[PDB]
Amino acid sequence: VYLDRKLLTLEDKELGSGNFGTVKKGYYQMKKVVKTVAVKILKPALKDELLAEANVMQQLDNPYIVRMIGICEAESWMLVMEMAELGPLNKYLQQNRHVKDKNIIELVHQVSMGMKYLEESNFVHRDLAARNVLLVTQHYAKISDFGLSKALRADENYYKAQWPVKWYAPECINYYKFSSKSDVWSFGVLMWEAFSYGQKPYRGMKGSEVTAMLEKGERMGCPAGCPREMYDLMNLCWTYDVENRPGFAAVELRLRNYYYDVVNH
Numbered sequence: 001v002y003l004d005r006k007l008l009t010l011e012d013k014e015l016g017s018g019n020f021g022t023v024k025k026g027y028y029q030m031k032k033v034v035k036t037v038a039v040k041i042l043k044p045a046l047k048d049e050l051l052a053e054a055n056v057m058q059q060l061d062n063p064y065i066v067r068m069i070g071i072c073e074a075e076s077w078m079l080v081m082e083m084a085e086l087g088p089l090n091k092y093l094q095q096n097r098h099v100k101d102k103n104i105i106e107l108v109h110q111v112s113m114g115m116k117y118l119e120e121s122n123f124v125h126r127d128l129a130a131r132n133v134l135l136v137t138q139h140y141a142k143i144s145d146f147g148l149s150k151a152l153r154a155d156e157n158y159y160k161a162q163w164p165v166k167w168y169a170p171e172c173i174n175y176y177k178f179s180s181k182s183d184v185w186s187f188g189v190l191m192w193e194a195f196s197y198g199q200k201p202y203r204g205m206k207g208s209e210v211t212a213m214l215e216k217g218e219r220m221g222c223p224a225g226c227p228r229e230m231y232d233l234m235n236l237c238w239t240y241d242v243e244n245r246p247g248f249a250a251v252e253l254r255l256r257n258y259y260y261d262v263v264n265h
């Protein structure tokens with residue numbers, strides 16, 4: 001897990017920031033080949049935050065989740081991850097307006113496969129948004145950004161916080177309780193983003209106005225040209241009651257079946 005700084009070259013290419021610090025493109029010399037990487041660079045609590053994120057990524061092994069190469073202790077603490085060259089899903093759809101519905105379905109279905117694995121592993125993501133979905137290719141999506149992620153206690157199906165509010169389920173906002181079903185709500189917001197060509201959800205609204213909207217039983221309207229089946233699935237992800245809301249196994253299956261209806265014209 002510990003990487004050699006002399007084997008890492010940081011490119012003059014920024015992929016993200018904050019916070020925290022910056023994300024830079026880089027190249028890491030492996031045992032024989034160089035690997036293209038994304039390097040999360042820290043610039044006291046922020047150190048433990050990065051190490052807990054590294055500890056979460058170390059435990060995960062699925063084709064639809066970004067792979068961590070390792071950690072690097074140098075000028076700054078660094079988290080070295082495999083590069084997804086096409087970048088975030090929202091930015092991609094904003095700039096590539098001719099992506100077919102079949103293709104958007106294929107991508108969000110891959111996200112649902114990665115989340116089904118996270119659900120089975122009893123980890124909660126807590127930052128599941130289109131900006132955190134990375135494209136390896138136009139037909140291959142991966143879940144990234146485990147900065148808010150938690151390993152659930154063995155005796156509880158939720159993490160209690162002691163925030164990307166527009167992606168959060170009511171139980172998160174009201175009770176600070178985060179479960180895999182809370183990630184399903186976020187997934188519904190992500191699907192809305194993907195079918196709105198990366199438009200931000202709840203445009204022009206304050207967090208408190210979003211809470212009020214949701215509590216009155218209101219939800220974002222159907223994106224122009226969105227398949228009805230996909231909008232219906234978003235509304236099922238947006239079930240107020242955690243108990244009636246589907247888990248990722250049920251979501252993955254519905255997306256998979258709908259994908260085959262679309263693939264076969």
Ligand SMILES: COc1cc(F)c(-c2nc3c(NCC4CCNCC4)c(Cl)cnc3[nH]2)cc1OC
Nearest residue numbers: 015016023038081082083084085086087131132
């Ligand atoms: C065309 O514009 C982009 C192309 C890119 F390839 C990338 C990129 N960023 C990462 C990345 N980390 C940072 C992103 C985590 C999710 N939230 C967004 C920033 C990691 Cl871990 C692995 N591959 C990545 N590819 C970013 C881009 O625009 C921000």
